[PDB]
Amino acid sequence: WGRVLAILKAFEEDCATPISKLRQVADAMTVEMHAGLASDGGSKLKMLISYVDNLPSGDEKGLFYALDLGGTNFRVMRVLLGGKQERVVKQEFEEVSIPPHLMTGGSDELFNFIAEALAKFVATECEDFHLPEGRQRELGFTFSFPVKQTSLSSGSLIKWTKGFSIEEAVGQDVVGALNKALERVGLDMRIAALVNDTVGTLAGGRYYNPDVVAAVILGTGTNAAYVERATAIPKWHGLLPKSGEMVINMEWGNFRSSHLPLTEFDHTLDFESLNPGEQILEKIISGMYLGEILRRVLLKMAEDAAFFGDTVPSKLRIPFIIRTPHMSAMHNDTSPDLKIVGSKIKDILEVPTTSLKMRKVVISLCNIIATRGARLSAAGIYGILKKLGRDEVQKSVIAMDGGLFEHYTQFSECMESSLKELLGDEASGSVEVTHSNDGSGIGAALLAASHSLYL
Ligand SMILES: OC[C@H]1O[C@@H](O)[C@H](O)[C@@H](O)[C@@H]1O
Numbered sequence: 001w002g003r004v005l006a007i008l009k010a011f012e013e014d015c016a017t018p019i020s021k022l023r024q025v026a027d028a029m030t031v032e033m034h035a036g037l038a039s040d041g042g043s044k045l046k047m048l049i050s051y052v053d054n055l056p057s058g059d060e061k062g063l064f065y066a067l068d069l070g071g072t073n074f075r076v077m078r079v080l081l082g083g084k085q086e087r088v089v090k091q092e093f094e095e096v097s098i099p100p101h102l103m104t105g106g107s108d109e110l111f112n113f114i115a116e117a118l119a120k121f122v123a124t125e126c127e128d129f130h131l132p133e134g135r136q137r138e139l140g141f142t143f144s145f146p147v148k149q150t151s152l153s154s155g156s157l158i159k160w161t162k163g164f165s166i167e168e169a170v171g172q173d174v175v176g177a178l179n180k181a182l183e184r185v186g187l188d189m190r191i192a193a194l195v196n197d198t199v200g201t202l203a204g205g206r207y208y209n210p211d212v213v214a215a216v217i218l219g220t221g222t223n224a225a226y227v228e229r230a231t232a233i234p235k236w237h238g239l240l241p242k243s244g245e246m247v248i249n250m251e252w253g254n255f256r257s258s259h260l261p262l263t264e265f266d267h268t269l270d271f272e273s274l275n276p277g278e279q280i281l282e283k284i285i286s287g288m289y290l291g292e293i294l295r296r297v298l299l300k301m302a303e304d305a306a307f308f309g310d311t312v313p314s315k316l317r318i319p320f321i322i323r324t325p326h327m328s329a330m331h332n333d334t335s336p337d338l339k340i341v342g343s344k345i346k347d348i349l350e351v352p353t354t355s356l357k358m359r360k361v362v363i364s365l366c367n368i369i370a371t372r373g374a375r376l377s378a379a380g381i382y383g384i385l386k387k388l389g390r391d392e393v394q395k396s397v398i399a400m401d402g403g404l405f406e407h408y409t410q411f412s413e414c415m416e417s418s419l420k421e422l423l424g425d426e427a428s429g430s431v432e433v434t435h436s437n438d439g440s441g442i443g444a445a446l447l448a449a450s451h452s453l454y455l
Helices: 002-014 019-038 107-122 174-184 197-208 264-271 287-305 324-331 339-349 356-387 403-407 409-428 439-450
Strands: 061-069 073-082 088-097 138-143 147-151 154-157 190-195 212-218 222-229 245-249 396-401 431-434
Touching: 002 287, 002 356, 019 356, 019 409, 061 107, 061 439, 073 107, 073 439, 088 107, 088 439, 107 174, 138 174, 138 197, 138 439, 154 174, 174 190, 190 197, 190 439, 197 212, 197 222, 197 245, 197 396, 197 439, 212 356, 212 403, 212 409, 222 356, 264 287, 287 324, 287 356, 287 403, 324 339, 324 356, 324 403, 324 409, 339 356, 356 409, 396 403, 396 439, 403 409, 409 431
Parallel strands: 061 138, 138 190, 212 396, 396 431
Antiparallel strands: 061 073, 073 088, 147 154, 212 222, 222 245
16 A cells, blocks of 8 residues: 555645645735736636626516526526515526537537527416516526626627537627527527626625625636726726626636646646646636546556556546546545445446545545645635735625535535635634525526516
8 A cells, every 4th residue: 555655645745735825826816817807818817897887786576587508507597586575586497417419519509409498498487487478588698608798798708618619609609699599499588698607696696695795606617706896907998887896707717826736637637638728727626627636646546556456447547437426425424434435436436345445545535635626716715805905894705606615515614714714813704605596597687687678
């Protein structure tokens, strides 16, 4: 077990995020926020204008549809809004796993999948959700990819991230593409808003809590949005919003700094990915990648340190075979025999069985990987708070969403703890991390509700 332990120790050390490194990252993040707001091409942080200069207040009422395209899942929903006291009276939704072939196929095919699913959902309208005869359906479109926004309800795709690669779609208007698809299925919908999922989550949180100033997604991918002062955005002067505010989609997944604790496994993951050199921060934080970092460490232990015996298990060679929900399960195991770790490894990798020593290393690996991702997330949030100048009783709330933060308890608890550590005793009480909802989707509908053409 000597060589295995040597790899583990080295990995542990290389992944280290002491409080000093987190401060360095937060500062680097804040610098890049200024640079990305200064000019369109001056930073790894795109800092995209959302054209959302006003967030939902809670008094919104009516019937609204929302559409949410993520990296792995697609969601359609409709809500009935009843104002300040009733809020969300009723909500109906469906979720569909995106067929992997659609992620790298053609543009029309993807939008057809979206429109066809929506048309089936609309067909189930009844009772409370029946469309009033003299009205049309109003829709908020959550699109979880970088978009060059041209208005509240228009913008073109900058690039794909996560598992997606449809080169045909790059530079095309996303709303226009959806509109064509809706027309292909004969569906009539007014698209009231196009928002990134971070922006949707921000609107969802603000709807319930006036103190919400930013939103963070920790799911398949990672990103953050926040409310910036319009005057503090030198690169942009389209609208002159009465609010003096403008929500920014940071696209922080693309953040890179020399301060990032990268390892050889991160480098090989990146070098062999769909988008080499891009989304560097996301590749060490988000759910798509955490399990893949684990697989690559285990693969090296298997190849060079006989971790699984004399032969490398074939399933260990399949990229993304180990997923973050597996990690969550294993990490959570406190049994003396580590029976959950043993069961999961055996199911995924198809190995005969695992000794306790093997299970200890795996869970140690899970903790190292999750802890690095969680602590860097906290540094990013701290970076946002610095930008807002909030590092009295000017309470700041961060709305959270995503499968990592929602289901991976060790991860979420570590992130919050690290953030409060960065804030320190004095400033700790001024910042709060909140909830989740299905905010990405619901938020887009609430934004549509703010811009409804009906009374
Ligand atoms: O879903 C969270 C994030 O995933 C990233 O890969 C995308 O580039 C962002 O647009 C999105 O906000």
